[PDB]
Amino acid sequence: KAIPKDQRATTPYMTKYERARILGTRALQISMNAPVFVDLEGETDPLRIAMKELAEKKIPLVIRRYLPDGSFEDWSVEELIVDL
Amino acid sequence: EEGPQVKIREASKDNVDFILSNVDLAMANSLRRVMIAEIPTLAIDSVEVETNTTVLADEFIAHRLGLIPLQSMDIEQLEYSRDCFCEDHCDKCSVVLTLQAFGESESTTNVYSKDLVIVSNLMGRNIGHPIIQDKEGNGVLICKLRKGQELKLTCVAKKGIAKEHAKWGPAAAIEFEYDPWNKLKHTDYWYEQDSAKEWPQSKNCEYEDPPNEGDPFDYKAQADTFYMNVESVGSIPVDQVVVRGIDTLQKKVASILLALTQM
Amino acid sequence: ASRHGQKGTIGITYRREDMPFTAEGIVPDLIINPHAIPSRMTVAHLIECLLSKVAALSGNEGDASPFTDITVEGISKLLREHGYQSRGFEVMYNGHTGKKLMAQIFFGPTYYQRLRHMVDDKIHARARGPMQVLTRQPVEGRSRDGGLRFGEMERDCMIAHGAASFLKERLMEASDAFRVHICGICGLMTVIAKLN
Amino acid sequence: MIVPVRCFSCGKVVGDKWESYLNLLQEDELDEGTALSRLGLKRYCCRRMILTHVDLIEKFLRYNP
Amino acid sequence: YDRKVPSPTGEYVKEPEWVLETDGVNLSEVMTVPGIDPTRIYTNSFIDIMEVLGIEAGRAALYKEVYNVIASDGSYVNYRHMALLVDVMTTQGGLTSVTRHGFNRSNTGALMRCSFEETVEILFEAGASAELDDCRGVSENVILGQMAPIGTGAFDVMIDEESLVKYM
Amino acid sequence: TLSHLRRTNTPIAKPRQLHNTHWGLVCPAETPEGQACGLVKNL
Amino acid sequence: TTFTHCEIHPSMILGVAASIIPFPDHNQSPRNTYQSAMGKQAMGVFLTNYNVRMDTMANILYYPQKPLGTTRAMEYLKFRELPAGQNAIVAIACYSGY
Amino acid sequence: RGNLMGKRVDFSARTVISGDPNLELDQVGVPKSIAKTLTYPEVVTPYNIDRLTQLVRNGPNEHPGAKYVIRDSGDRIDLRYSKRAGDIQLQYGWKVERHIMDNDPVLFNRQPSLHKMSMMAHRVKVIPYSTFRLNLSVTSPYNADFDGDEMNLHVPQSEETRAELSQLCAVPLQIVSPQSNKPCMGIVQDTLCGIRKLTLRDTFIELDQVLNMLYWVPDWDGVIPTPAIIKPKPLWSGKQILSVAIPNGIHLQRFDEGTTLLSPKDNGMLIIDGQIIFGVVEKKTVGSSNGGLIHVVTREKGPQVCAKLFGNIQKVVNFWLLHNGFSTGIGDTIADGPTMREITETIAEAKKKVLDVTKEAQANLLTAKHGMTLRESFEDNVVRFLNEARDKAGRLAEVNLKDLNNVKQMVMAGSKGSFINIAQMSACVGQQSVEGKRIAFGFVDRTLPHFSKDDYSPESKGFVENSYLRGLTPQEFFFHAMGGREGLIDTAVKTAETGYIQRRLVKALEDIMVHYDNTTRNSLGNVIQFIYGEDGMDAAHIEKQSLDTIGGSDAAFEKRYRVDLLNTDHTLDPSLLESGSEILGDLKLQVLLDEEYKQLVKDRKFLREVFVDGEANWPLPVNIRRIIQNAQQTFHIDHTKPSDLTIKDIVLGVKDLQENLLVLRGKNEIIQNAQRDAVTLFCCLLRSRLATRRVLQEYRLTKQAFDWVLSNIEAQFLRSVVHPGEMVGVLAAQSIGEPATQMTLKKVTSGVPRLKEILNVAKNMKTPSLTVY
Amino acid sequence: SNTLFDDIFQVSEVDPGRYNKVCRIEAASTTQDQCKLTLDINVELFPVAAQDSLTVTIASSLTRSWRPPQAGDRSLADDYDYVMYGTAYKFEEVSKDLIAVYYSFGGLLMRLEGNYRNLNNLKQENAYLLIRR
Amino acid sequence: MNAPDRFELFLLGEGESKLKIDPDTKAPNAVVITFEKEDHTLGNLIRAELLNDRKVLFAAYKVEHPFFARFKLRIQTTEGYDPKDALKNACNSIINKLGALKTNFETEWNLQTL
Numbered sequence A: 001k002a003i004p005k006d007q008r009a010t011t012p013y014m015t016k017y018e019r020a021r022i023l024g025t026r027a028l029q030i031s032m033n034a035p036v037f038v039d040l041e042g043e044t045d046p047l048r049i050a051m052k053e054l055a056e057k058k059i060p061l062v063i064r065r066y067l068p069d070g071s072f073e074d075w076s077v078e079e080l081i082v083d084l
Numbered sequence B: 001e002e003g004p005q006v007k008i009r010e011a012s013k014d015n016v017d018f019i020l021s022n023v024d025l026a027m028a029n030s031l032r033r034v035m036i037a038e039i040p041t042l043a044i045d046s047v048e049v050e051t052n053t054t055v056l057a058d059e060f061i062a063h064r065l066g067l068i069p070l071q072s073m074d075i076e077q078l079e080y081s082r083d084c085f086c087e088d089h090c091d092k093c094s095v096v097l098t099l100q101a102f103g104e105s106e107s108t109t110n111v112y113s114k115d116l117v118i119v120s121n122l123m124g125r126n127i128g129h130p131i132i133q134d135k136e137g138n139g140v141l142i143c144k145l146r147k148g149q150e151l152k153l154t155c156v157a158k159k160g161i162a163k164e165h166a167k168w169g170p171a172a173a174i175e176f177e178y179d180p181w182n183k184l185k186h187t188d189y190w191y192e193q194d195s196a197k198e199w200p201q202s203k204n205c206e207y208e209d210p211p212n213e214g215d216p217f218d219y220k221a222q223a224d225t226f227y228m229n230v231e232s233v234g235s236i237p238v239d240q241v242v243v244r245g246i247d248t249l250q251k252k253v254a255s256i257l258l259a260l261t262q263m
Numbered sequence C: 001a002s003r004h005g006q007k008g009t010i011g012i013t014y015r016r017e018d019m020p021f022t023a024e025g026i027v028p029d030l031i032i033n034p035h036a037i038p039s040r041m042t043v044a045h046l047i048e049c050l051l052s053k054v055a056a057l058s059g060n061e062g063d064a065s066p067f068t069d070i071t072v073e074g075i076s077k078l079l080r081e082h083g084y085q086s087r088g089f090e091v092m093y094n095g096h097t098g099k100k101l102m103a104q105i106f107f108g109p110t111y112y113q114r115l116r117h118m119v120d121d122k123i124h125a126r127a128r129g130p131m132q133v134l135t136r137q138p139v140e141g142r143s144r145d146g147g148l149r150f151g152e153m154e155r156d157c158m159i160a161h162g163a164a165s166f167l168k169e170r171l172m173e174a175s176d177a178f179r180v181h182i183c184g185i186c187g188l189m190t191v192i193a194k195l196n
Numbered sequence D: 001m002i003v004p005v006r007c008f009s010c011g012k013v014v015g016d017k018w019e020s021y022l023n024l025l026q027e028d029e030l031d032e033g034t035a036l037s038r039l040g041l042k043r044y045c046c047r048r049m050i051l052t053h054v055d056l057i058e059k060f061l062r063y064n065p
Numbered sequence E: 001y002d003r004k005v006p007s008p009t010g011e012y013v014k015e016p017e018w019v020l021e022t023d024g025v026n027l028s029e030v031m032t033v034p035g036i037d038p039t040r041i042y043t044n045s046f047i048d049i050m051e052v053l054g055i056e057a058g059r060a061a062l063y064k065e066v067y068n069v070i071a072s073d074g075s076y077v078n079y080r081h082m083a084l085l086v087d088v089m090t091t092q093g094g095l096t097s098v099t100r101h102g103f104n105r106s107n108t109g110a111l112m113r114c115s116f117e118e119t120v121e122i123l124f125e126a127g128a129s130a131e132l133d134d135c136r137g138v139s140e141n142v143i144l145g146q147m148a149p150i151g152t153g154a155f156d157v158m159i160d161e162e163s164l165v166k167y168m
Numbered sequence F: 001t002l003s004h005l006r007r008t009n010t011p012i013a014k015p016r017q018l019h020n021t022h023w024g025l026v027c028p029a030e031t032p033e034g035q036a037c038g039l040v041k042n043l
Numbered sequence G: 001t002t003f004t005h006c007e008i009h010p011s012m013i014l015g016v017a018a019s020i021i022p023f024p025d026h027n028q029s030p031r032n033t034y035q036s037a038m039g040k041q042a043m044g045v046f047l048t049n050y051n052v053r054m055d056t057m058a059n060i061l062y063y064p065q066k067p068l069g070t071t072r073a074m075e076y077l078k079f080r081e082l083p084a085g086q087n088a089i090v091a092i093a094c095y096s097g098y
Numbered sequence H: 001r002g003n004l005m006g007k008r009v010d011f012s013a014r015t016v017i018s019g020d021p022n023l024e025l026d027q028v029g030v031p032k033s034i035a036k037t038l039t040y041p042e043v044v045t046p047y048n049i050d051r052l053t054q055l056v057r058n059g060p061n062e063h064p065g066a067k068y069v070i071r072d073s074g075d076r077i078d079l080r081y082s083k084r085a086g087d088i089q090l091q092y093g094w095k096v097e098r099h100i101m102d103n104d105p106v107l108f109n110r111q112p113s114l115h116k117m118s119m120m121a122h123r124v125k126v127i128p129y130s131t132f133r134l135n136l137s138v139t140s141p142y143n144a145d146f147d148g149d150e151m152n153l154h155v156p157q158s159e160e161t162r163a164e165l166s167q168l169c170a171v172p173l174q175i176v177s178p179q180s181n182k183p184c185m186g187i188v189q190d191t192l193c194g195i196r197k198l199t200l201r202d203t204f205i206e207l208d209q210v211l212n213m214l215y216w217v218p219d220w221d222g223v224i225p226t227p228a229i230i231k232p233k234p235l236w237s238g239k240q241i242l243s244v245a246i247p248n249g250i251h252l253q254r255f256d257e258g259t260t261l262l263s264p265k266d267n268g269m270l271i272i273d274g275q276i277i278f279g280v281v282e283k284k285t286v287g288s289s290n291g292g293l294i295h296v297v298t299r300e301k302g303p304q305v306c307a308k309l310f311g312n313i314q315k316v317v318n319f320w321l322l323h324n325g326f327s328t329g330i331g332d333t334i335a336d337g338p339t340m341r342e343i344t345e346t347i348a349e350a351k352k353k354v355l356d357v358t359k360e361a362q363a364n365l366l367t368a369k370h371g372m373t374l375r376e377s378f379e380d381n382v383v384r385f386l387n388e389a390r391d392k393a394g395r396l397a398e399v400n401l402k403d404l405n406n407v408k409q410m411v412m413a414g415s416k417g418s419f420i421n422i423a424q425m426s427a428c429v430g431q432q433s434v435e436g437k438r439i440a441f442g443f444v445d446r447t448l449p450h451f452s453k454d455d456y457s458p459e460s461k462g463f464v465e466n467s468y469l470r471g472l473t474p475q476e477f478f479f480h481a482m483g484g485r486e487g488l489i490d491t492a493v494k495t496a497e498t499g500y501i502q503r504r505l506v507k508a509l510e511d512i513m514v515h516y517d518n519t520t521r522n523s524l525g526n527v528i529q530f531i532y533g534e535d536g537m538d539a540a541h542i543e544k545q546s547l548d549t550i551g552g553s554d555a556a557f558e559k560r561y562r563v564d565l566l567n568t569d570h571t572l573d574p575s576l577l578e579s580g581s582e583i584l585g586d587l588k589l590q591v592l593l594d595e596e597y598k599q600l601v602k603d604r605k606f607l608r609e610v611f612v613d614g615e616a617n618w619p620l621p622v623n624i625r626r627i628i629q630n631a632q633q634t635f636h637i638d639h640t641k642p643s644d645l646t647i648k649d650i651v652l653g654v655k656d657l658q659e660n661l662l663v664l665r666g667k668n669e670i671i672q673n674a675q676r677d678a679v680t681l682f683c684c685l686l687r688s689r690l691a692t693r694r695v696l697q698e699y700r701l702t703k704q705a706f707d708w709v710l711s712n713i714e715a716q717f718l719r720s721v722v723h724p725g726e727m728v729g730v731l732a733a734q735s736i737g738e739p740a741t742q743m744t745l746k747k748v749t750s751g752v753p754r755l756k757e758i759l760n761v762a763k764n765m766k767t768p769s770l771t772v773y
Numbered sequence I: 001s002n003t004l005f006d007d008i009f010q011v012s013e014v015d016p017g018r019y020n021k022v023c024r025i026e027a028a029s030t031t032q033d034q035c036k037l038t039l040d041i042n043v044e045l046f047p048v049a050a051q052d053s054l055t056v057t058i059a060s061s062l063t064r065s066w067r068p069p070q071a072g073d074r075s076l077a078d079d080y081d082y083v084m085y086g087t088a089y090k091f092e093e094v095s096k097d098l099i100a101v102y103y104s105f106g107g108l109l110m111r112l113e114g115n116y117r118n119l120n121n122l123k124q125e126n127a128y129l130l131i132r133r
Numbered sequence J: 001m002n003a004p005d006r007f008e009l010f011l012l013g014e015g016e017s018k019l020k021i022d023p024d025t026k027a028p029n030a031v032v033i034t035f036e037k038e039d040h041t042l043g044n045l046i047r048a049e050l051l052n053d054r055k056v057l058f059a060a061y062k063v064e065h066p067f068f069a070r071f072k073l074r075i076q077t078t079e080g081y082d083p084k085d086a087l088k089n090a091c092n093s094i095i096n097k098l099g100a101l102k103t104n105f106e107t108e109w110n111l112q113t114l
């Protein structure tokens, strides 16, 4: 059904499952020769580069949050706060 | 003389009870261990079984042959296999012993270490000789056999030390003690009523002056005096098992200075 | 294992250099942890040591038979008649330094059985290999090169952990996994795919 | 099953002392504990070694080829 | 028994009291008797405590009882869990048992109840009354080799091509 | 080997237990853990 | 003063296994029940004609030793003839931590 | 069930496990044999190419190497054969099945699996010999011994797969278990036992060693701490250095029994800025306890930092106890001769306290207690006597055993064994029983045939007088059997039946998880809980705190929370508040001040309406007690000079605080209303601890301190919330079934057979009872 | 770079509660009948029996790794026979105008009582203790 | 099976030196010397002697894990005095002491009967 970027209702923060999966997912790509959006301070381990992209919040992904009834909310790694 | 001195007490061909005085504990032990594990010796390390009918299986005897102590006084002039340029061993790094037995006697024939035979050139030096201390003169019973049971071997002895295996070590045991009257309180005796009575006294109390109640606790007291007693197997005369000890240990402490140099 | 349900396995081997010794010279062959006593409450095992450490010196095959007229007190006397502390303990020096061990250790013989089931008869690894025929899943047993189990319970934990992908992975890419075709009409495997 | 050359724990040679000890039993008719001390085995470690070993070999020997 | 209570002064004090313990169970009547507090009366047979007092109260009992089964061993479990369970066993309507005769009959798709005690029997009567399965169940996906909607999969991840530009 | 020779089996009302009558005839401590425990006894 | 009969010895209530266990009258009742199942997972000399037996799988302990501590019950269990372990110089203490 | 719901799998190994006090907590020793067998598919990338070609060059036999290269053309190059073995040029895109290497995360586990924790991820550490070597403390979670236990290891495969292990399954994360809102790994055996000894005031350490010990803690800042004692010989206290392992910032107040900031018995426990100030360190301080050291470090410093702690602590202790030696032997089981005879009669005095009642009933002179046979009433006392004896017989040996007895020591540290054990070995065994009723009459009217019929005396119904030291008697022996034998039985029943319960429970709640809206639903959509746990908090972030507002006389309450700016004796003495003197009287403040109080007041009644018991200690998110403790020494607050908080500053921020403690976020009423609810309980605690008077008279917070204490609470709370994703259903199940396996077993159906009853919703319960007040 | 306390006390009693090497001590002051003392002490390197004349001192001087000997010829505020170093944890108010402070030297506790160290006793860890005769 | 070869307890393997000296940064003027194919025997010893040199502010050593023959020794000294040099002496000192003992022992042995 979708939901406006306003009227948004989820948690402003990133869930462990999310972050967990983002890094993974991102690694996977990086490990696949996808483009890396951060300067590698010399890093060479994908999941480690991923940890970097994720701290300069330079990961081009979007976490779609399905709700019990099907509608979803879309947040960007950008927005989502990362406490953990 | 200059520093750490000794006062040998009893002393035979197999033991060397003695007293090490004015040294650091570390040093006493350091030595002890050295004696136990790193003194180069000789012993069987390869058995080429040609024929055997005994009830002891091949590798069994094998193991035994290794344990059987061998002469090793000139050891210090028989290169370790790994260094001698010969493809897999030579008179210049190894000793060869043969073994043959047959059940001629209609009543159990014994195979003793004396039945070993040296077939490699000795080059004139005390080595590779099955050491005997048995009254009769046949030491260490290798194995028995019946009717027509045979046993043709061939061994090769090499250097090696108690690190690579004990069958090499010459030590076999070593007494060690100090502060017979707990003066540094290096312990806390466990009792039910009174330590003194329940916890036996050591023959080594005498050689050191008793307590003297009143006296406060001596704290600046360290550890002079140790009552060792290097025993021995025979591969080496109890003395060398103590000299070569102080020797090998010393060489090591050098190869650190030597390495500090090439660096 | 001893003879008191004291089953336990090796953790490491040491040599006389590193081994804790008793002035006499002697050193142990075994070194079981003190903790394995208080709750097992097997004192018999504890006693056998004393009885044996005695009949080891006297050479009089100690008797530890069931209910009899023997005592612990009755033995501590015999061991004392020999010079070593009446309870078994002895002074010992820490092999690395050679310093004394503040406390004493209950030292002395004990019979120990070497039960079968050794390690190199179980160590087992597999990364793909023989595959069953009916199922097409890894075969069973270390004997046939088989694979290990990831059953219900181990799943239930991954679900717990919330480890979605890893679950799918154990379940597919590392076991079954198969590519079939369907009809968008009648949801069956009917389809006759000539991938060519 | 044959005497154990050398003592486990301690290390001292002990493979010869079989017959010597075994004799101090039938002939010189003595009691274990003492026999040992005479053979030189003083500490229980290298003591228990003899006092226990059961010479099965003799039984083994008694078969045939 | 030992029952703590509000002293007039404010403190909480040990104001013990006598109480009767039964050995049979007929609530609906022992309740209507003179002399007792028909407000604090409690039977461990929640089955009963639910037919009389009412489900909601029942839950409170079912829980209370279960809690006592874990505390009698000196172990502690955080509410939430026994709570959740007690709840699952009660929402539906009355007392739904954690057994083949209960929670395994609910509107949950086939494939899921499949993985428990009646398997084929359950499958058969699925193609019979042409059931439809959502594949929202954990089990479901596991059987298909699909990433289930669980933690790591309670959502989707996408490449916002837009933000994939300001990044360079 | 001996032990195995003196063994007892018992198919399928509180058997598993250790009975008084079991004194002197069957061993009290020798029996298999869990499963068929107390169903197999040693004389 | 009625005793019709009297037990040869009490230790005869035990069975094969238990009769090897030392001081059994000094253990938590169960600790014996286990030991009455491990002595069956041990190694020794199951016969002496083994150098002539072609049985699938078998273990012989190089240097068997008749136990120091014993039981009169062993004499009939022919133990001192075919033991199943070794008298080892034990040391109950904490060391490396292994 | 056996093919789809569970399968045999590849990339898996199993062997025997053994302890190795030299591995970090989160590691695991993989034997080279296996590291060389197991493989990981890495994808050739400029980042590695080099490293990878090396492994490929190395081959499948050396260790750090590989054994399979695969190019785009979907073809396997078997490194062990192929005439091109050493040749090969890699290609970006190709993959290289290589060997498992140091630090490849893997899933380790021990069946039976019934915990999130029965399976955790470890750092792989390739080691020789053949056994998985795992750290000790991570033992209890897997619930394993080294008595020949085997464990399974699974190896990840996708770069994202690993991700899931290291980010959610790694051991350091499992430290605080939600199944019981407390840590779940601790310190045991040697490390524990030893950690106590090393602590004692009595225990002093000299230079030569202190130095080595320092060296062992790998994160030592190279600052040989200043000796406690310097006088003749510079010495160090155990406590002194074990504290080198304890990281800065930590804090800890204990208070056992006789504790007094000078704890003579050296009880309690107090650690400041991470330096042990006083109190023996044992099970209660460094074990898997509630307010434990671990419990803190974790929630405070980090999950990674706490994992590193086990390491340090262990190494230090272990190395010390390594030399300080330790052991146990029979002598520890024998107490003072007089204490023996004193017991022999304490038993015998208990035999006549029985005999008397035996005859006193053999005459029909006993009042039949209500609801019990004259018989049932006879036994009930008998047993109660013998046991009353058996226990105090022990309490004698338990006290006559010296602070040097090893066995006792182990009991104190709590590393092993308990009271009963001492008793049964040294004093008196006990009265054997079967089904409650002491050994029965199998033999017509008597126990054994060694007894004259109708002999009810204890020496027949099954009472063992001797101790395990003395040795049972034939009769005693047999009875103890029959009795012990009962255990071995049900144990093997409470194991089979437990397994089922545990399973159902799971299948019954799989589908349940917390959904993004913060509701708890299953696979249909059916709400089960409208807020996980009636509060939305992840069990993991919770501790026992105290709701001071509840307990305490109506009197004390006033003297503590009441503030009246219109009274010389009920106002804040200006010695506390900067603007104190200029407040006394101000009427517009007295209203805030009075609002505050008419609230703390409402809170009271409210709480007393919920927790009737009067019990004040409850599990809740955000540990405020400690949150302040830090604020304290973090701003070196001096208890002398005055604060600088406007009374508004306070009361008007505490309010603004509650405002940001959001659980649910909805934009309407029905939702933004459940909000206030799910919080309510918390705030009470909140308003309780941040009450004006308190805030200024007990913990002299400045504005800085306060504004900080506030920030922390809000965020530390927003952390304790529950993550929409958690598969709470399974969790809950396990959390219950799990401890339902550890159940190893005043006269009612209780325990496992009971729990079975309950779940089955059985109509005919053995015991039906019912309490009426 | 100062000193922070001076006085002499008398041991009312010495207590060994299952501590072979250390006994806690309580003594009184030979001046103000206010200053009482409670201090744990190593009765092995510095024996002490009931009723004696001990001299107590404090001060924070004569925090970077501690250097071994060498000082065999350097500074030495050691004109005593017992010198510990620990920290002070609490500053209690024993009613009235009485202020007491507790101390701990990694295991050895201490309690002081009086009222004139209002500006003498700091509140920092630094706090060497001393004893003579 | 996985059991290493016994002789890896004393024989250095391909490309390794008895010593490896890494400069400790944790504190100024101090070092971490890694001794290969060695152990307590020589470690503890060079540690004690090394503790006498009044110029040695710090000195301890440790076997990182029983499985491997090797150990780390950390030494700290007074500025203007390189520790490497300190190590030297402390060994010479150890040798010399031994040089005497080898002598003084034999002295007493020659004077013996048996």
Ligand SMILES: [Mg+2]
Binding pocket: H145, H147, H149
């Ligand atoms: Mg087990």
Ligand SMILES: [Zn+2]
Binding pocket: B081, B084, B085, B086, B088, B089, B090, B091, B092, B093, B094
């Ligand atoms: Zn050669």
Ligand SMILES: [Zn+2]
Binding pocket: D007, D008, D009, D010, D011, D012, D043, D044, D045, D046, D047
């Ligand atoms: Zn020996």
